[PDB]
Symmetry: D5
Subunit: 165 residues, 10 copies
């Protein structure tokens, strides 16, 4: 893993589905803003949808504090798009306001230390990157357990508070 707290967050780049289109997306696109960068195991599964939806549905609570959110898994951009176009009824994402980054090669997952060699996908990893691109926080969950939008919010606010004061 290249991910070290208080060091620049490992650079990434790749294709994301953004508002239903394929776009190239870079970590550096987010300079000036805080970024919640998180990995989830696999599209068309179970815990991964709920926590992606929670974040998307509450996106304004981040954007209103100069914070953006990006989600990532090892699935392809085509699978991401198919998942978005799958209605929440059938366990899809439905439309989403958060970019879904594809880590097909696994390079990004490995740089961030969240790749599972034995499974071929990531664990539940979340990274808080500040506006200068420095990594400030790392949350790694074993697969069965989702993350909390409220705890994330609290942490972003705390770093912004201690940044200032």
């Amino acid at each position: 893993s290249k991910a070290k707290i208080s060091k620049p967050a490992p650079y990434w780049e790749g294709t994301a589905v953004i508002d239903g289109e394929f776009k190239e997306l870079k970590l550096t696109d987010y300079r000036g803003k805080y970024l919640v960068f998180f990995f989830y195991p696999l599209d068309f599964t179970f815990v991964c949808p709920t926590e992606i939806i929670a974040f998307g549905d509450r996106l304004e609570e981040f954007r209103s504090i100069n914070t953006e959110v990006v989600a990532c898994s090892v699935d392809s951009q085509f699978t991401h798009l198919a998942w978005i176009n799958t209605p929440r009824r059938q366990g899809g994402l439905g439309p989403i306001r958060i970019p879904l980054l594809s880590d097909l090669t696994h390079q990004i997952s490995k740089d961030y230390g969240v790749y599972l060699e034995d499974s071929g996908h990531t664990l539940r990893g979340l990274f808080i990157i500040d506006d200068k691109g420095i990594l400030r926080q790392i949350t790694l969950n074993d697969l069965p357990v989702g993350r909390s939008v409220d705890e994330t919010l609290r942490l972003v606010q705390a770093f912004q508070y201690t940044d200032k004061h």
Copy 2:
């Protein structure tokens, strides 16, 4: 760093201050129970010990769910005891129910990947270890920002739940929330 989620937590042992006394403490002493194992940077700094006290005050909430808590820093056991014997009034800890593990050699810190080579102490790292001694959760904070007892409680409850019923826990899940059946078909009963 030997700490890997879903592998056995890196073994450790050392001197801890427990109820005012020096006691030898081992990771294996906690087999059978969940363990919240966390590091904080330094004794005796100018910031009020809000997090260690918060875990100390709410310790019964963890014990009611088969969970113990252990705190650790690179300070000596002697410094730990001195800090405890210092009134909260003056930045001390005052009495405390949670053992304070000493990591003078830095070995434990390095094994958990929380040691800061440039500073000579740890960042704020917390680890949730299950009753079979498997590591389930890693939270690493930059120095300025403290940890939440509630969030820690939520995570411990969620792991114990999914241990038991297998069903997986959605984002935000607290006790009493809807869970998911980990099946492409069974998942519909939730979505």
Copy 3:
């Protein structure tokens, strides 16, 4: 590095496949005693219609009548495979299909067969004819834009079985 060598035993593989809507464990050795056509395709859910997977599934009986099974594989998860199968052909989906779809999430199978694209994170179009003793007899590698011929695969299989016999 690639372990696939003609007239040597085909590189062993195992993983999760989707067979008739369900997740099943599948191994190379499950096909001992039969010829196996083992082929890789890049990705589920792309905008190019699944002509070849369907062509094979539609003509599967021409294979089973000559003691030959067919298996398809990509780097997609078994969950994606299922979702694709459960998407109507109308919308680029696969629809029901009679061929197992094997998941190579870890990329280990793709690497062993030398079909993995390090730069792209999926495979090219590789097809392998494995005999009933588990020996690799044929290797066909296509650059992405160009599909494979069921008729050619049939001809090759029949040919190998003929020269096996006479």
Copy 4:
């Protein structure tokens, strides 16, 4: 080790070929600007009739009409190649032939293309489709007993040229 990788430049080769009864130097680069079907066969003067070399030579115009050349290669010397060509088809010879026969005496070409059999000292049946920019587009490797199809090679070439264009 093999240097042949799809969507990379085909491994460079050079040597002596027999072209229309004569010895000529020949290089991969001589075919820049054209598609090239480059194929290996085991050995001259064996007791199995030269069905495939002849099939290609007989249908060579179907290739030249789509900007495609054909080259055949084995580990035999150019002298053996010539002697084979100068042997009547009646007696297993090749007879006159319109395809260059390239000699790979040093085995270096066979190794670079990953078709050499260390144990046997000749190659298997390998065929390679190289595009007009010298990029490798297709790899077909057959175990010895089974030949190649001119129709399939045509279909593949046309297909690559189509997707090049559209």
Copy 5:
């Protein structure tokens, strides 16, 4: 390993020290032009350690009047050093002290002076006498149970200054 060698420049150090109740950055080079008695002790809130530090502190003028300073050091943080100083001698604290207490939290300085105990995570009782030119002249290492002597130290400093001169 230890960089501390008699008759060679003393291993450079720098770090945070508590000086008259405040955190100051302190370097070995701040002592050029003066003799320096630089000594390590194990841990704050321990037993011999206070008594040795108190003795050197209380008799500091006997050093300063021969152009000699004194610095003490342990692996304790500067926050622990300051808390110890603000502990009344009654309760085993240092009480106010005139000698800087250097912090070696990273262990780098202890290791450079060869006094660190890998097994225990703190130093033994090492004392070093460094001349005004920055040259190490004397090394004294005691096992933990036994304290050093101000009188012996004074005698040594005087002996060196005398032989320097005559």
Copy 6:
């Protein structure tokens, strides 16, 4: 490297010493059961008076009365040691002496104790205190110009023996009869 590490077994040595004017084989292990003050000095026969060897020799009974022996060592041969001892103190010689003079001709002992000066071919002034169990307790290294103190050496031996016996640790300057501390909070 130097093998001398405090609270580890002192590096084994053996060699020929001059003892009461005779050549004797001497081993570090010969001193088990007693404390040993083992010290190096540079060279026999220089133009600086042998103040420190004589001082230890003259006061040997204070060491012996506390179960403690003394051995001196330099890189000189045993023949040079003997010649020096047979030279009258009047003429810089040692005169008779009660302390063994161990010869370290091969330089191995000096190297093992990390007192050897590679550029000079002799040792600096090093003194080592070894307990009854063969464990190194104390290392004193002096640059060449400055000698050692019998009183300080006596105090250290007494202190280590006191702490061996009572555990209680010895404060700065502690001498026999002074206040000690129970290593307990």
Copy 7:
């Protein structure tokens, strides 16, 4: 090269054309007899035929002194057979009484130090192996120049003479 005078001749084995048939042939098949073992560049060439024919046509002069002769090149056994079935008129060998060993893999040529890396075939190399399998003589010619049956005969006779006396 493994070929050293007064050491056992490097072991070889391979397929030869013997009286128009393919046979497996081993160096050890010749124990009890002297062996003239020689390499020539390529079938369907120029100097190689004449010196093979000279040896074959004078084979009795070797067999009458307990000596056998084997020829070798990198050509395949199929090319050897085609060459034999090519009439001397057209530069073939015509029928031949000497085995033609195939060194398709080049292992034999390399063991004997006669392989030409740059050309893919051997130079003109001749080895005299005694009846105990010890190498006694080595003759290496650059490609333009044939060997002499008379000189070979003289050498075999000399070794047999000095063996005895």
Copy 8:
């Protein structure tokens, strides 16, 4: 061993006895001419020096074709001179026209791959080197068996022929014999 057919012959230099005198001799001294360079095992043995004498007696046959001859062994130049000064009657060489190169260091022998590590001298090795200093022919004999001047003459003539006319020489070829045109077509005019 650095001797490879169709590569430049391994360079050498040393002291040779030439017409009773000690002379420094170099391989490069023979550029422009063919060189027959041969090794024999030892001076002064109980076997009559039939081969060195045979080359000495027939030396004019080589010089008439732009070819020199040099013999070499591991013996010193002093032993070489002594051997020459010994009457053929008594196993000596008696006077001789061919230089005798000394290889005391064994370097030259090792470079030509003729040195016998177990014996400390060479086997019987002969080397034919052309006028451009390229090695054309290597003949290695076990100790018991001598070399033929006629065969050496034949080989030198054949190389000079094929150098000149390119046409290749068939087995047994002596001057005046049929040669072959090195072409799949031109070869018929011979066969």
Copy 9:
């Protein structure tokens, strides 16, 4: 490198020597129970070499009468040694001699005794005195232009036998 070390067993040697006109195999161990003066000289048919060998040969009884033998050695073959012996002293030969002349054609012995000159292909003038127990006691190495002395050698042998005894 040289294995010859004073007070250690002399490096074992063996080889062919000319002894009274005949070739005999000779080993260092053939001399156990006696002192051995073992010396090297450069080359047969040279200059100082004969004179030194002649002197030791002519005065051999002075060695044998103190239970000491003498062996000489050069890199010359045994055939050269014998031819040299059969050369009249007039013509610079040795003439008949009573000392074995060991041959070191392979250079192995010279190298073991550290007397070989890589540059020249022969030895310098090295002399070794070996006791009756096979222990090397003395080494004398001279540059080529200067010969050894029988008297000095005798004196040394006598000195060693005397100190051995008393």
Copy 10:
């Protein structure tokens, strides 16, 4: 390894010697332009009389009359050398001596000349003859019990100087005036 190789430059050395009772820095290069007899002996102050150092000292003028100097060396310190020289021959001492006694305290010189005995910490008896150009011409190594000969040393120096001058080589036993050989057939 030993760096002493015949017909190669003698291994450079420098150090402190006692010369006419004074400490002087001495370098091998100080002897360029003259032959040098450089020899090692084991130890100062033993119970075997200094026969060979005295013999060389007593006969020094025979060396000096042929452009040849002599230096003796042991691993002893220069202070020990001085004490030994100041000890009367009566008492095993050296008494005054005309030959420099070079000190090899660090053992480097002894090691460079391959005369050092690792197990003993001193040298065997080695003698080296170095010409005016710094080239080593002769090596004589004796086991400890047996001393060296001034006459033999004189003969070797004379021989090397003769051959230097006339080329003609010197036969066995050659002394000044004896028959020599023109190195020509």
